[PDB]
Design an enzyme around this catalytic site. Structure first.
Site, PDB file in Angstrom:
ATOM      1  N   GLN A  88       0.805  -1.205   0.000  1.00  0.00           N
ATOM      2  CA  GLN A  88       0.000   0.000   0.000  1.00  0.00           C
ATOM      3  C   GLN A  88       0.849   1.271   0.000  1.00  0.00           C
ATOM      4  OE1 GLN A  88      -1.609  -1.435   4.227  1.00  0.00           O
ATOM      5  NE2 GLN A  88      -1.611   0.796   4.293  1.00  0.00           N
ATOM      6  N   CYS A 123      -5.211   0.304   3.884  1.00  0.00           N
ATOM      7  CA  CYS A 123      -5.310  -1.131   4.190  1.00  0.00           C
ATOM      8  C   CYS A 123      -6.727  -1.684   4.121  1.00  0.00           C
ATOM      9  CB  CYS A 123      -4.718  -1.416   5.576  1.00  0.00           C
ATOM     10  SG  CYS A 123      -5.585  -0.519   6.865  1.00  0.00           S
ATOM     11  N   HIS A 139      -5.696  -1.819  11.932  1.00  0.00           N
ATOM     12  CA  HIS A 139      -5.210  -2.220  10.600  1.00  0.00           C
ATOM     13  C   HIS A 139      -6.129  -3.303  10.061  1.00  0.00           C
ATOM     14  CE1 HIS A 139      -2.019  -3.109   7.649  1.00  0.00           C
ATOM     15  NE2 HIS A 139      -1.841  -4.302   8.199  1.00  0.00           N
ATOM     16  N   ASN A 165      -1.065  -9.694   4.291  1.00  0.00           N
ATOM     17  CA  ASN A 165      -0.983  -8.295   4.650  1.00  0.00           C
ATOM     18  C   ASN A 165      -0.581  -7.478   3.420  1.00  0.00           C
ATOM     19  OD1 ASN A 165      -0.808  -6.031   6.422  1.00  0.00           O
ATOM     20  ND2 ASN A 165       1.217  -6.637   7.115  1.00  0.00           N
TER      21      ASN A 165
END
Length: 212
Positions: A19, A25, A159, A175
């Site tokens: 990102q 996120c 997150h 992630n």
């Protein structure tokens, strides 16, 4: 449901993304669940646009943070374009969906899994990738290089990431900090400790898209 589930092995997870500086996120998290449910229902594996959610979800705050569930609701109310047609810039811009022509996919809704219940989350992950939240401000999460993550960390969730599998003692997480973090962009977080919150707050708010 199986002892081990891993959706990358079943061909429903695309490459790990980064990102950058932008706190996007929430968009990245929603997209991996969309990518996953389209593969499961139609057999087609495609990448979808996080940038389009960053620009067009006006309940979220762009690069300052946002909501996984609003991005998922947006894809059910309107749809989403291929990543290729609306690439990632890392800065919030004007919503350019009309300029990109017809939407590439559209979902039938969004559902929440029962919070603070490990079994509920395992039963949803065995059916599709799910969008989950956790506390990532701690130094331990940030410096993770591999192994099963046991913490330390509290519950102050900040997150959004996506659960794409599980095993007897972990939940497998994709992630959006690129391949140079954790196990090639993945983390395995400890499960089965009787703690209702989940380690690092993993069982706080989890959502998935519906496609008939």
């Amino acid at each position: 449901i199986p002892e081990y589930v891993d959706w990358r092995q079943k061909g429903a997870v695309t490459p790990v993304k980064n990102q950058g500086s932008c706190g996007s996120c929430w968009a990245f998290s929603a997209v991996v669940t969309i990518e996953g449910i389209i593969k499961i229902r139609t057999g087609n594996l495609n990448q979808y646009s996080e940038q389009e959610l960053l620009d067009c979800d006006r309940r979220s705050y762009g690069c300052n943070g946002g909501y996984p569930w609003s991005a998922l609701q947006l894809v059910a109310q309107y749809g989403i374009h291929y990543r290729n047609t609306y690439p990632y810039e890392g800065v919030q811009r004007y919503c350019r969906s009309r300029e990109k022509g017809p939407y590439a996919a559209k979902t039938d809704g969004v559902r929440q899994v029962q919070p603070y219940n490990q079994g509920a989350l395992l039963y949803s992950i065995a059916n599709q990738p799910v969008s989950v939240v956790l506390q990532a401000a701690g130094k331990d999460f940030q410096l993770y290089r591999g192994g099963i993550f046991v913490g330390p960390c509290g519950n102050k969730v900040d997150h959004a990431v996506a659960a794409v599998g599980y095993g007897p003692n972990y939940i497998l997480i994709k992630n959006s900090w690129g391949t140079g973090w954790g196990e090639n962009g993945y983390i395995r977080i400890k499960r089965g400790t009787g703690n209702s919150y989940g380690v690092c707050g993993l069982y706080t708010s989890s959502f998935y898209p519906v496609k008939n």
